[PDB]
Structures are given as C-alpha cells and as structure tokens.
Amino acid sequence: VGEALEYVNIGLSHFLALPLAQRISLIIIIPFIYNIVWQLLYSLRKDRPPLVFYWIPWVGSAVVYGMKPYEFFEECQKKYGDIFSFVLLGRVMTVYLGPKGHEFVFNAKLADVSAEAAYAHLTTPVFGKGVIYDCPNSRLMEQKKFVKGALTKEAFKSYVPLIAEEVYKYFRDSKNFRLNERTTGTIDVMVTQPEMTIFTASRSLLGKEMRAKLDTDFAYLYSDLDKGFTPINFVFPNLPLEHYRKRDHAQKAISGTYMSLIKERRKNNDIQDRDLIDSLMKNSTYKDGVKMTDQEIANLLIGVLMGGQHTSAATSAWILLHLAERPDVQQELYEEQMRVLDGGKKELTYDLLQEMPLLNQTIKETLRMHHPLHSLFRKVMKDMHVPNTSYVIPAGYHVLVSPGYTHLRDEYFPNAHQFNIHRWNNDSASSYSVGEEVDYGFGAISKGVSSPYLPFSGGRHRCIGEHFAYCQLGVLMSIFIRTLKWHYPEGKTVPPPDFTSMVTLPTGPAKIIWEKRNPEQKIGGRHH
C-alpha cells in the first residue's frame, strides 16, 4: 500500500547513489530501451505511416540514408510501400515515393508545409539575410519573379555568344586544356566543370566586371563560400570554427563587391539591360511597395548563382562522363552540330540551340539519371491527411519527396539504368505542362505535378533556372562536341554518385582523356 510508495522513494534514493560507472551505463541503456519500446508502440498506430526501425536514438537511419538514399528508398518501398517514415538526426522524415508523392508535397497547400522552415538554417548563412528562405513565401515568389525577368529569350540570345566566348577562353588558357599548345590531355571533370560553370554563369548573369574579378584572388572567396554549402550545416549551422568564419567572411566580401558595383552603376546612371544586376536594379520592388535593399539584391545574386553553380556543374560533369564511354553518341551529336551549324560555318545562336534535339535530349537524359538533388524537403506545419489512406502526418514532421528516385524506376522509364538519349525522341523539351496552368507569383507553370520526369520540381517552389541551365549546358556541350573527342582511361567507367554532398555530384577523381578533333585548330585572342 503506502509501504510500496516508500520503496519507490527508497529506490530513487538508491538510484542516485549508484557508482557513476553504472550510472553512465544506465543513462545509455535507458534511452536505448525506451527508444525500442516507443517504436514498437508506435507501430500500433494505424494513422501513422510505417516507421523504419532504428537502433540508435536521435541518429535514426541517417547513416544509410546519407550514404545510399535511393537504395534505402527501394528497400523501404519493398517492405512498406510508397509511404513510410524514418528518423534522421532528431527529425522524423515522411517519404512519399512516386508521382502521387510529387502531388502530395509539391502541390501541398501553403499553410500545410514550409520549405523555408526546412532550408533556412542551411542557406541563410551562405547567401545572406532577407532573401530566398530568410523571408516569407510571398517574398520568395516575387524574388523569383525578379530573377525570371533577366531570364528571357532575348536575354538568352545575348548570353549565348558570351558563354561561348568563355568556353573558348577556357579551352585556350586553362592549364587543363591549352588547346593551342596541346592536342590531347587528361582532366578531372570535377575540376574543369565547376570552373567552366562559374566563368560562364558569372560573365552572363553578373557581367564583365564580376567575371573579371574571378581572374584574381577574389576567386578564393567563392571557394570559401562554397564550403558553407554543406549538409553539415543542417545539423551544425554555426560552430565556432574557421570553416564557418571564412564562409561568413566570404559572404560579406562577395556581397560587398556586388553592392559596390550596384551603387557605382546607380551613381553613374549606368543601368542598362546587360545582366541580372541591371535587371534587379530596375526591377526589385515588391507588390506592397517595399524595395529590396542593395544587401538583399546582392544576397539574392549569391543564392541564385551558387545554386545554379552546383546543379549545372554537376550536370555537365555527368554528361561528359556518360559520353566518355559512348563514342557512338558523341558521333551522333557531332553530326547534328555539322548539319545545324552548316559544317561549323554558322555561329551558334540561341535559336540554333533549339534546333539541336539530340544535344538537348542528352541533357534531358543526364538529368533523368542524375537529378542533382536526390531529396526535397518541406516541414509539415499542420496535420496532413494522406488521401485514400488513414495516415495522418502530424505537424513537426518533415515530408520528403524524391523525383530522382522515380527517374530510375523501370516502370516509368524502361531500362532506367541505361543511358539512352533516344528515349526522348520527338520529346526533347526540357519539360512542359501537359495541361492546366497556375501562377504563384513568378509566371504560369504546370498545375499538375504528376509527371514521373520532374528534375525541376513543380508547384510554388519550382525551378526558374531551367532555361538558363539548358542554354549554358547547351552552348558548353555544343563546343565540347565540335572541338573534342574524349574517352576513359583504361578500365575506368562512370563513377557512382557522391550522395553525401549538397548536390549528388560524381565520386572523384573522375578523369577523362580528351583529344582535339582538329589538332591544328587555333583559338584566337590575347593571353600572357
């Protein structure tokens, strides 16, 4: 009776007096035991998707998910089906695989899920305050509208010869090529492509001043800011270490440079239609009348250039890598170049790029097999009912959607693990809406988000850099094809993806051997 409760207190007393050898042992085994008991109890709930069993509390399935996410998804899909949850470094992730998952997450109501609540911890320290995910959604919608204003057909027409010039400059001057001095050589594509991507993106979107600054020690700052863009920042966004200080310094230094150019252009009234800087200076006033600050404009520049940097560089690296073991595809692409550009006598233009279906299909196919973002997250803000199930996703959970996984399923893409650009025959468009449209604030886009092919997502958070990426990748690959042949070192093949980084770039070093199609061909212009 009450004598029982006396022994409760006595037991508590004897608990606190255990040797700290047993106490430490107990504060390990008790959370461990409770974790297992909780999961087994959790599995009784029929309004919750199945939860992947895990031994270590808090950690969850982080190790297997972090290293081989698609293999994790497939095993989980076999056991539980398309909807299942797993614990990830303190968080509960609810995965919804397949097209229905795309609809459930990408077309979720604004009040139901939050992208910025999921990503702000990562991106804000890198890009700066006030923009992208450090603001309400309505602000992001208009920022996208602003950026999209410099991403027009007319802009792409002017970008193409600029991007082309940068590619030829890189072939001429970079130590990785030097085509005027060498006719063959070995490159690491994870060295060349990030460089070619930043040179071409900077020249076209930022302008000649900012491009020129990449020829200096300023370039190291981009590398510093680069290191801040890492999954580690999802768990440890701010540790007092040098990595984080160089990042924060780089952000200030780079945004300061952008603001300097911005204020100079405005003081000289030198505001044209050259680049994204000009565009944002003329067009960055929200609908409620508030103007973006020069800091916010610079930070938006950083975010847009940085994101486009990683997605595009990774993509062109995969293209080169897949093509390295496919001389048949290089050959077919080369013939297309000769036919469309009249044996090379025509100058490449944006309009001529659109008449290169096989080149564009090659980009399209590479993006199928190598979605640079294997997982997209939203934080659940309100309890969500999953249609045609009894499942309820409580607020505090995160939903995870993965079109890249569906890209690699035989059911939706026959022989999915085979690189075949001809699966897109007479369907070379980067993507398109097969029906009704909707405008979230940055232009009419597809209402339905059910396509098995969805490398640019859909819904309010859909990519707006798709046409720029195709323009950039197109020009670049057009010139690679016309200038070089390339192949693997003996016994080398397409490397496995590095799923552990921010984008799922190839595992390096990923080397290819190039050779000039025309050994005698010289690239003009001056250099020291």
Residues lying near ligand HEM in the complex (CB under 6 A) are found at: 115, 140, 144, 147, 304, 307-308, 311-312, 315, 367, 372-373, 376, 455-457, 461, 463-465, 468-469
**Shortest separation between residue 132's beta carbon and ligand TPF, angstroms:** 5
Q: How far apart are CA 196 and CA 192, in angstroms?
A: 6
Secondary structure of residue 484 in the 3-state scheme: strand
Q: Please, which residue, 123 or 362, has the CB nearer to ligand TPF?
A: 123
**Shortest separation between residue 465's beta carbon and ligand TPF, angstroms:** 6
Cβ–Cβ under 8 Å, residues 70 and 405: yes
**Shortest separation between residue 121's beta carbon and ligand HEM, angstroms:** 14
**Shortest separation between residue 392's beta carbon and ligand TPF, angstroms:** 26
Decide which of ligand HEM, ligand TPF, none touches 469; Cβ closer than 5 to 8 Å per partner kind. Answer: ligand HEM
Decide which of ligand TPF, ligand HEM, none touches 91; Cβ closer than 5 to 8 Å per partner kind. Answer: none
Q: How far apart are CA 350 and CA 421, in angstroms?
A: 21
Secondary structure of residue 392 in the 3-state scheme: strand
Q: Please, which residue, 308 or 495, has the CB nearer to ligand HEM?
A: 308
Determine if residue 133 is labeled as part of a ligand binding site. Answer: yes
Q: Please, which residue, 127 or 424, has the CB nearer to ligand TPF?
A: 127
Q: How far apart are CA 369 and CA 506, in angstroms?
A: 12
Secondary structure of residue 39 in the 3-state scheme: helix
Decide which of ligand TPF, ligand HEM, none touches 502; Cβ closer than 5 to 8 Å per partner kind. Answer: ligand TPF
Decide which of ligand HEM, ligand TPF, none touches 144; Cβ closer than 5 to 8 Å per partner kind. Answer: ligand HEM
Decide which of ligand TPF, ligand HEM, none touches 312; Cβ closer than 5 to 8 Å per partner kind. Answer: ligand HEM
Cβ–Cβ under 8 Å, residues 373 and 404: yes
Q: Which amino acid is at 284?
A: S
**Shortest separation between residue 461's beta carbon and ligand HEM, angstroms:** 4
CA dihedral for 145, 149, 153, 159, sign (positive or negative): negative
**Shortest separation between residue 341's beta carbon and ligand HEM, angstroms:** 24
Cβ–Cβ under 8 Å, residues 316 and 193: yes
Comparing CA positions, the residue from 308, 332, 334, 344 lying closest to residue 471 is: 308
Rounded to 10 degrees, what is the CA torsion of 521, 526, 527, 528? 120
Residue-by-residue DSSP string for 153-197:
HHHHHHHHHHHHHHHHHHHHH-TTT-TTT-SEEEEEHHHHHHHHH
Secondary structure of residue 53 in the 3-state scheme: coil
Q: How far apart are CA 90 and CA 101, in angstroms?
A: 23
Decide which of ligand HEM, ligand TPF, none touches 315; Cβ closer than 5 to 8 Å per partner kind. Answer: ligand HEM
Determine if residue 422 is labeled as part of a ligand binding site. Answer: no
How many other β-carbons are positioned within 10 Å of the β-carbon of residue 452? 15
Minimal CB distance to ligand HEM: which residue?
A: 465
Q: What is the DSSP letter of 292?
A: P
Binding site for ligand TPF (CB under 6 A): 123, 132, 303-304, 306-308, 311, 373, 463, 465, 502
Minimal CB distance to ligand TPF: which residue?
A: 307
**Shortest separation between residue 463's beta carbon and ligand TPF, angstroms:** 5
Determine if residue 287 is labeled as part of a ligand binding site. Answer: no
Decide which of ligand HEM, ligand TPF, none touches 464; Cβ closer than 5 to 8 Å per partner kind. Answer: ligand HEM
Q: Please, which residue, 54 or 229, has the CB nearer to ligand HEM?
A: 229
**Shortest separation between residue 276's beta carbon and ligand HEM, angstroms:** 8
**Shortest separation between residue 373's beta carbon and ligand HEM, angstroms:** 5
Q: Please, which residue, 315 or 483, has the CB nearer to ligand TPF?
A: 315
Q: Which residues lie closer than 8 Å to 277 by C-beta, 6 or more apart?
A: 206, 207, 210, 258, 261, 262, 265, 297, 301
Q: Please, which residue, 65 or 377, has the CB nearer to ligand HEM?
A: 377
Q: Please, which residue, 237 or 441, has the CB nearer to ligand HEM?
A: 441
Q: How far apart are CA 375 and CA 399, in angstroms?
A: 10
Q: Which residues lie closer than 8 Å to 520 by C-beta, 6 or more apart?
A: none
Decide which of ligand TPF, ligand HEM, none touches 468; Cβ closer than 5 to 8 Å per partner kind. Answer: ligand HEM
Determine if residue 461 is labeled as part of a ligand binding site. Answer: yes
CA distance to 91, 218, 432, 523, 528, per residue, from 156 (Å): 42, 27, 19, 24, 31
> Token pair for residue 411?
């059911």
Q: Please, which residue, 205 or 262, has the CB nearer to ligand HEM?
A: 205
Q: How far apart are CA 282 and CA 300, in angstroms?
A: 15
Q: Please, which residue, 311 or 330, has the CB nearer to ligand TPF?
A: 311
Q: Which residues are annotated as a binding site for heme?
A: 463
Q: Which residues are annotated as a binding site?
A: 119, 133, 144, 378, 461, 463
Q: Which residues are annotated as a binding site for heme b?
A: 119, 133, 144, 378, 461, 463
